[PDB]
Amino acid sequence: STGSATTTPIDSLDDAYITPVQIGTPAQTLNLDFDTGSSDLWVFSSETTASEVDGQTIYTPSKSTTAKLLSGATWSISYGDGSSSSGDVYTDTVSVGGLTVTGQAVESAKKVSSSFTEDSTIDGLLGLAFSTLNTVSPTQQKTFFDNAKASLDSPVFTADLGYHAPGTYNFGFIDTTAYTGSITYTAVSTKQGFWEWTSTGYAVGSGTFKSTSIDGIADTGTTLLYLPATVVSAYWAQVSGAKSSSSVGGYVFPCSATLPSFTFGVGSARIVIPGDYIDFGPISTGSSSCFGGIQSSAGIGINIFGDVALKAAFVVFNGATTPTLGFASK
């Protein structure tokens, strides 16, 4: 089997991407944030505290003939940005782009934090990291990909995120028309539950490539690119007037600037992030100070290749017995 679904930016800044997902019988379609940095599929639901729902589409298990309460099971998750959610668990049929899993754990939110309530476009998350991070207790549950894997033509999914435009998540096959050149594969460590890999270095604009190992995660659920302070300083030093602002919470730059590109290494290959991808616009409406798309990972504890990086590439998440990651230009 295979599946193919279009993923769409939630706003003009590509802050996140939503992908339609069919849950239950008859289908209830919710727009979920596919997140390679977590491993819970959770939804706004009929059980979500009413004051914490503001425009989202909800899953109502009582209207699905295939929903079953997973008795005794609860979940609770906290994300790197400080947001959180928790609730109980159903199993139900879940389909993404024509690919169907029966018996998928669908984590129903009883509580969500402010940032989720305030984002009316995101109806939940679909985690695509390794199932070892799944938070369901007392019986840990598998991700959608993990459940689908055996049935897939090939044990892979791919992320093809757009810059200010729709893109695609594919399951079970590699679309050879979706990228240019060759795909370069690189080793993955699953020790922390993430798609963790080591970049071979970076360049700023037309500058010379610096060979240096940068360990990080491929995370579709993180908006920006978070890298070591040394790397980030070298980038922003090439933008007149750029500075790190404690009050704003990172690097800002004059909105009148033209940003240089940023290149990262994948083995001997290179992925180029155009400068425009690194512009996240005014810090506040009408401001001439703009927020940068490359930020320091210092104090996160991990480097994160988020959407800024990943949308510059066609990315293969290979869930074979020995997992790997592949990157191609497009």
From Swiss-Prot:
GO molecular function terms noted in the UniProt entry: aspartic-type endopeptidase activity
One of the GO biological process terms: proteolysis
EC number: 3.4.23.22
Reactions mediated catalytically: Hydrolysis of proteins with specificity similar to that of pepsin A, prefers hydrophobic residues at P1 and P1', but does not cleave 14-Ala-|-Leu-15 in the B chain of insulin or Z-Glu-Tyr. Clots milk
Disulfide bonds: 255-290
Domain Peptidase A1, first and last residues per copy: 17-328
Domain of life: Eukaryota
UniProt key word Iron: no
Membrane-spanning residues: none
Residues at the catalytic site: 35, 199
Keywords, alphabetical: Aspartyl protease, Disulfide bond, Hydrolase, Protease, Signal, Zymogen
Family of this protein: Belongs to the peptidase A1 family.
This protein's name: Endothiapepsin
Lineage of origin: Eukaryota, Fungi, Dikarya, Ascomycota, Pezizomycotina
